[model samples]
Target: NPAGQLTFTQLCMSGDGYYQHRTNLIYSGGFVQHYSGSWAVTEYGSKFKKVDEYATALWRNVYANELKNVVDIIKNTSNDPAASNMNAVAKIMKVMVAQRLTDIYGDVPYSEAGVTPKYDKQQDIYNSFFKDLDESFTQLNASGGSVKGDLFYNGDISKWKKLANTMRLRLAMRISEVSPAEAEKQAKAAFQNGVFESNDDNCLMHHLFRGNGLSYGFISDEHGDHFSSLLIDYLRDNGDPRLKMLATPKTGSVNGGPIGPGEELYEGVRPGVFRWEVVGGSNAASGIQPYLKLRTTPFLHVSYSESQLLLAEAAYRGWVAGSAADFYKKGVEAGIKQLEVYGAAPASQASIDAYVNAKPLAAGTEKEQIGTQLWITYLFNSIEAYSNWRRTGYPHLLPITNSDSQTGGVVPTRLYYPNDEMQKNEKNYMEAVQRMGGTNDWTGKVWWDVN
Candidate 1:
């Protein structure tokens, strides 16, 4: 209230509406992938087929929702200290978000992201994110010792600065597949400058747990099927220790398999999905269990493990000068460390060492080895893992389940712009179309996704 005069700082002169409505684009992808053909948490079943296009939806909003906000907050909030860190926060946010967007889209709305100063070309957007991240790092370092009323980090400017650097490394690695030269240089620079050196400096923001609206983990079972089942099976079958941290042991048992009840073998009526038409009443029998509603789980943003994995990649690629194996070991260790912090059951060091040592000592494909390890590490963050899959084409995942109709077949590469954009922001939407080779369907690839 006291900062009412800073209204412009609070909101942008233009594009606020774009960010407001599109902010959910990123969030929905997580849920959609879960519900899409693989999990079918929804009673609608395969009707939600476009889950593969999660990246496409994210591509659209990375510019509209996030990068645009960076420009808005930075332009308006220069004078206020909180506002200043807000700018830094937005920069880190933009860099982090932009990395995901471009990782999927290839060439995205960088230059034109929030530029009332004339929309720039897609090429400019790519070049500029790398540049802007560099600038963001410098600016964060320059901010006063205190971050006044900063909501994300509690007035800790230094932590935000470290986040800025970490984001740089993440972006560098995301693009490493396509542009190895620049990828090598920037990734090394970011590492040399230092990054989220410890778990204390992970880059996630907190989601409140006080209200019905605030409790946003594993929402309705119908909405979280894909990850719930696939991830559960993956961990349990592999003897992954983090399994209990994410979910409960099955009560009954599968007919021939492990200790607990498999989805198909469980007897008796289940609560969540069994009640739905798609799973229970279908001509073919389906399972009727709910996702392990670990109400204790908190929302996570970024983590030390993610940063360490990026570093490992940078080292592996000769971007940063370090022992690739050592960095890989660090990546694995950091991941287990995060489970202790974020996983409900908590991790043990002995188990972590065992998990890390499980990697094959025999040599084969380096990319596959790295990607597979990272995939295991990214069990919770399916979006990031999915993005890496797009970038590296690793793990050779199975197609979405057969019963799924809408989201069956090959996973979609992109999403058509949301229906609202056609009616409300037609001009801007069409302009984006003209810029990106004139097609906006799920089939059209973004700029950086040369893979």
Candidate 2:
């Protein structure tokens, strides 16, 4: 019933469930700062309000949808040899879900997941992730059983196993700056355990509520979100091959005379700006590529590209063996090639090779280069893009300097908590807020977000 149980999780929920969190969290926390086609509350992520709905979307659905259902799923499947794979997959998926949860708010209710439950420190939550991943791998018995209702990989145990190891790599990377030795240990162990080898092992979810790319509230040509300038400018400056594949040519009055059919004039909106602030009010901003706006567009959660890029990064840091240059090329290639999953032709091999050839891993610039690629590789996934940017400070985005900003024109480090937590779990909420300097603030950094 893992597949069936998955329906109860956020993956299978209506587009609203996924869209709410993705748009709200990502647009606010993400690289895309857009206007129109959605509510204003979303992009105002840095402008925190104590009880805002946009900020609470991810927090609310996760506890009610993914965590609640998955908790039950693990409970029923555990210890039953026939259900061992199911149990392991559930645990793995749970960690994936919680990774976003803990990363966003830092300390949160886990173990007890209670209104009165003490907020577990982020360090403890991260440790539990590794433990759960380790235990999950040990419990995987391909012969034990199949994961039912399987939307992601259709009950493939090996893919789930690969996903778990990839998660380990990701978590280890997240803590690398904070606890280098531990990060190195976990990273090495994850590589030894096995991670994604190619595109076939990527973890993706094609939703029933329309593909993640075309989430109703997220993107539509008419006022739907546009690419942020941060993404477009970087791609343009870098001569990145994936740019045209990801965003459509710009439209509307640019320099008056119509710009000769308006093809390939890549432009995007600035985040943190009010609607009236932009020139011509968003008519000229580049739209997302048509392939990305389909009703059946899939959402990439983790991929071979991400896996390779992380390896490139780890390799660069001497955390793992292999040439950082070799890994970087593969990761860039994998990222462009991965676009084929959208059913459109990915970047041609010639373009891919040209882009790759032009970009070599120069000494001392490897981290920024790999991190920027990670951002491009995550075009639709805001969580990882935001996290990577926060960790590496690459592609160098400026703070949302809008006068209306809630964080005083600063790029926020983390999101604030819900006011309901204050009302429902007064004591625990206060304790967590105390760590955030006695205010339910968004400017505070998370435990692993150390410089």
Candidate 3:
């Protein structure tokens, strides 16, 4: 079943399920609060009791197990054009999973760890990601046959090439502070190699009409997730049209009914500030804005909007050629425009134009401008938002006032290693902790989080 299930649909579906489960409730909650992604209880009160139990299980088993199934197929297959294409896809998939794992835990198993399963340093792991992506790009073109089971792009290798290059830009910017030289080199290369030109080439995991994690995560009757006040307040304050696009206003009484948008419909909550008993039982009595309640909302992975925003940052840093302002404008435009895929009614040209005109990229505040916009675009995809926040320190968020019991009142720098590692890979686990300065807590900064 594992080998037979190594189709593109299966891979993408697994990604949907994993991210819906991982990013929404677990990782996203680390930075912001949403009905769906709340860490209110753990981040504030019961902090250390459950030290990343599920997160460790997700990385070590949930994500890695499915990814390995596909990787094995690539390795065991013989030389052929089809195999070459599969190999290329497999490599990109591997880099995606590895990057997330490394980002979450810092210095995870990479090279020899797959077989012997030993941990590798974070720097070496990133270097390997770069190497694998480089090879994947070459293989994508040199390969002959078409890619089958391609849910992301319907088997379009060209689009996959664009995604690969764009991902290179993402990886490059991830180390912009820690490795500026490398960041510039790869970012420029990604630009020249071509990246997503428009929504046509956006990399999204499409959810079937039936149902998927994204839909179930937010729309289920039992699910009472809402948009974070941080997000709503920002959009509403800016007169951003996407507010209407993302959330619906309440039509019923304040206590019990579907949520809605508007000044009085609901007041969103910040993460780590809510009481445990209330959130678990009847947190929605205050009214909370729910996002894309439709069952068909696509699971966004990467998009043209994201690429343009990164390009704007790159141009600002002199890593690529283009107008930062122009890129910023286009990025904002594309970001709001692309919400149509999630069932948001398209904003009129007049609305979009006004918003763009009103919000020109601020001079001398290029990083903050780009970072803040990118943070909004990545509202649902919180891991990327958290990572960017860590790097640029934009959208300057504040930690919960009373939630400092476990982490000295600071937002955790990284998630702790899973208990599996401590029990089985004891020596390697200790070494990673020592390498991290004898601390494995959330406050421990990763190699690249210099700021």
Candidate 4:
């Protein structure tokens, strides 16, 4: 059980692959842009180069370690009815990892991932995600023994049930565009089962001050990353109070050169710029805040705010019964309240209420309104942020101004398959590639991202 506990902790509490993947995801979310700590790539795109060390880090580490460990846990507990909760926990964790894998790479080595496991199209992979969650939900039993190392909830079955349904709701929304009927069906089922009801149910991880890789990147390469203008500008333009808690004033430099003017105001770097100079040069962009840069900063894997916001979208889309405007208002308020976990004190309820009241959803703009708010709350996880952006086109991304952009300034859609897969799994890889018209292109659609 000690080993089981350890494996469970690694699910997300600490993992290099996840960090690497998330860093790129942060960049892709269009809220944070990477420059150079010590060096810069020629392409200088928002997302990392497909085959770069960073790009491969995700695909490499997950398979070799995280996925392997979780799969083993699932197989080990499969036949143990007494270990029912343990088995269910393992299966749920597997779905979390697999969701990230396919959401990023499109067609991935799923059913057989443990890779000569043929690349499963994302459509089928998603089907399996729902299937995995279905079995886990049925398997969850409070009477079963405590789940080992249940780090997120301390083997709390009730909270785990909420987490699972929250995840289901998320997957349901992801496919809302392509298949509204099925999406609504799955989402309503998830809602009926229950999802996070409040901040108390948030699946959060508090790491050490230097425990996070993204924050470490701040020290290792100050110029390497800064707040993206898209995020800062939106919050600032909307007079959002959360901006002060999230970003630092402009003081970044180009390369390792002299620091910027260190202005007190927050300003993010332009998303597609090759150099910070293009936007404002040195001291022109806001740096990440100390709270965010701390390794010990709490990582909210799933939260009440996100669930509420998704529900707001669900209501707006007519997938669920509720008032979209009310859901949006509450979602915004809850999001600001949740910021208490990051800042030293809780955000003033008055401020949140006022802000929520001020930003009422206009007629016919509910979808854009919901999607845009989601942009603000989803900042913590880039894959979800990017996926929602791709699906909803919220925040109305501007074309990349950089001439060197690989996707012609259009926000990137999907990452290329890891090169190792191309080299080793040639037979299965070819079939996957052929489906995409003989190439592992990036700008095209993923199965669920259909326009």
Q: Whose TM-score is greatest here?
A: 2
- Reference-based lDDT, residue 301, model 1: 52
lDDT per residue as tens, model 1, 94-196 = 5655555554444444545562223344456656776876776676745433344343466576787677777777667767767888788888888877788
- Candidate 2: 10-residue stretch with minimal lDDT: 32-41
- Give the alpha-carbon lDDT of every model: 0.51, 0.73, 0.68, 0.69
What is the full ranking by TM-score, best candidate first? 2, 4, 3, 1
Return the TM-score for candidate 1, rounded to 2 decimals: 0.74
Q: Rank the candidates by lDDT, best first.
A: 2, 4, 3, 1
lDDT per residue for candidate 2 within 210-257, as digits (tens), equals 445335444432445566677777778888887787777755654443
Give the TM-score (vs. native) of candidate 2. Answer: 0.91
Candidate 2 stretches with Cα past 4 Å from truth are 10-26, 29-51, 208-214, 219-221, 261-264, 273-281
Error of 4 at 336 (Å): 1.4
Question: How many backbone clashes are present in model 1?
Answer: 17
**Local accuracy of candidate 4 as per-residue lDDT tens digits, 6-103:** 34445443434244434443345442232221223224336334435544455666676667777777788777777788888877888887787777
lDDT of 4: 0.69
| Comparing 1 and 4 on TM-score, the stronger one | 4
Cα TM-score per model: 0.74, 0.91, 0.87, 0.89
Candidate that would win on lDDT: 2
- Comparing 1 with 2 on lDDT, the higher-scoring candidate is 2
